[PDB]
Amino acid sequence: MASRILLNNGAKMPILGLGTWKSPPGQVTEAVKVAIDVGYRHIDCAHVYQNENEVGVAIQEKLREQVVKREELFIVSKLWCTYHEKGLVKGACQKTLSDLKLDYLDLYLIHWPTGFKPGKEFFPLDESGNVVPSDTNILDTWAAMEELVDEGLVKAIGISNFNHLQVEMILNKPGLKYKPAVNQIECHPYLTQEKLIQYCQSKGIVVTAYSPLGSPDRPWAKPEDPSLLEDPRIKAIAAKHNKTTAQVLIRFPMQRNLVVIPKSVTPERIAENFKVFDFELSSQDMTTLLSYNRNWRVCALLSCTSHKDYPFHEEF
Numbered sequence: 084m085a086s087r088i089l090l091n092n093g094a095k096m097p098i099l100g101l102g103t104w105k106s107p108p109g110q111v112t113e114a115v116k117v118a119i120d121v122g123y124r125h126i127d128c129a130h131v132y133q134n135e136n137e138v139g140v141a142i143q144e145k146l147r148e149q150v151v152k153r154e155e156l157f158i159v160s161k162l163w164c165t166y167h168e169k170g171l172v173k174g175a176c177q178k179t180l181s182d183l184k185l186d187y188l189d190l191y192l193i194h195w196p197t198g199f200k201p202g203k204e205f206f207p208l209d210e211s212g213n214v215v216p217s218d219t220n221i222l223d224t225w226a227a228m229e230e231l232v233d234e235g236l237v238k239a240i241g242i243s244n245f246n247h248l249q250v251e252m253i254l255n256k257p258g259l260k261y262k263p264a265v266n267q268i269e270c271h272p273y274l275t276q277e278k279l280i281q282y283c284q285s286k287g288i289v290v291t292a293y294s295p296l297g298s299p300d301r302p303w304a305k306p307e308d309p310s311l312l313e314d315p316r317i318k319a320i321a322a323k324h325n326k327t328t329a330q331v332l333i334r335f336p337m338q339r340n341l342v343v344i345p346k347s348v349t350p351e352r353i354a355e356n357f358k359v360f361d362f363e364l365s366s367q368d369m370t371t372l373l374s375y376n377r378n379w380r381v382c383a384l385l386s387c388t389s390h391k392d393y394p395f396h397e398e399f
């Protein structure tokens with residue numbers, strides 16, 4: 084299978100990238116260095132992950148040592164919710180660029196459609212446990228993102244965790260200058276996203292699947308939760324193909340024309356997770372994996388369920 088997908092900005096995006104949420108700062112430099120050595124060319128980052136400086140050390144070492152050229156890398160980051168105000172967007176992007184030791188990002192995403200009150204706290208809460216919103220309209224946040232393209236700080240802009248009506252709002256924005264290149268959403272056999280994926284793809288927006296392995300290290304995991312990596316039905320498909328369960332879970336979105344960003348800090352898993360370009364799931368396998376949907380989310384943003392722009396009340 085081809086390694087990159089063409090975006091609506093004319094650039095090509097590697098379909099497999101390395102995730103970095105929860106990657107400890109003392110381990111993520113090694114993780115990214117190993118990833119680049121074994122073929123990864125796309126790293127998924129975010130300011131809220133609190134490890135971009137350490138990701139940047141790895142990228143810079145591999146650039147300096149001429150393991151890879153900058154034009155061969157595809158580095159993604161995301162604007163956190165407390166920086167939706169138009170006057171804060173550039174500085175937030177520039178902090179990410181400084182930390183990553185880059186002079187541009189390949190893709191910069193609005194991390195969530197929900198804006199929060201600015202300040203030092205990433206999740207400013209009130210006494211009900213609900214987030215303190217900001218009044219900046221997302222269309223205005225989008226215009227600030229467009230300015231980053233025109234200033235050369237980012238090659239492409241996109242969105243994350245936007246539902247179909249929110250994607251539609253941008254696509255219908257008065258005076259829209261750049262369409263979103265990507266919508267990055269949770270997607271795996273327990274949250275298959277047929278409706279939202281079809282909508283985005285029909286508009287030329289590439290979808291990136293996050294938490295493709297079901298995020299077993301998510302901080303709020305409970306014992307009674309389902310577990311993709313331990314699902315015997317998925318293990319059976321993996322065994323039939325002589326691959327690991329994780330490799331099936333990564334190949335699955337690839338065959339839906341999605342980008343996928345599995346996270347690991349374990350060198351052997353980083354290498355294993357990339358060995359997914361040499362086998363094919365059958366149509367029957369694909370339909371069978373789709374049949375496991377249960378609309379089950381790792382990332383439900385539960386402190387924000389009353390925010391006016393909370394994305395997950397709508398069907399898709």
Ligand SMILES: NC(=O)c1ccc[n+]([C@@H]2O[C@H](COP(=O)([O-])OP(=O)(O)OC[C@H]3O[C@@H](n4cnc5c(N)ncnc54)[C@H](OP(=O)(O)O)[C@@H]3O)[C@@H](O)[C@H]2O)c1
Pocket residue numbers: 101102103104105127128194243244267268292293294295296297298299300301312327329330344345346347348349352353355356381382
């Ligand atoms: N836009 C958003 O709002 C958003 C939200 C969630 C995630 N994301 C992005 O998507 C990335 C991936 O999602 P995620 O981090 O939630 O979870 P994930 O990639 O589904 O799962 C990561 C977990 O799987 C383990 N793992 C990795 N490869 C494995 C293998 N071959 N066999 C067994 N276990 C394996 C990792 O362990 P080790 O690391 O210990 O090896 C870690 O515990 C994130 O890191 C982030 O970059 C974005």
Ligand SMILES: O=C(O)Cn1ccc2ccc(F)cc21
Pocket residue numbers: 104129131194381382383384385
């Ligand atoms: O936004 C993220 O990429 C990951 N994340 C970090 C904190 C957090 C909280 C809730 C959630 F639903 C996802 C979350």
Ligand SMILES: O=C(O)Cn1ccc2ccc(F)cc21
Pocket residue numbers: 302303382383384385386
């Ligand atoms: O908010 C949530 O979507 C899930 N969650 C549940 C407990 C918890 C704690 C911290 C956090 F950052 C997210 C959390």
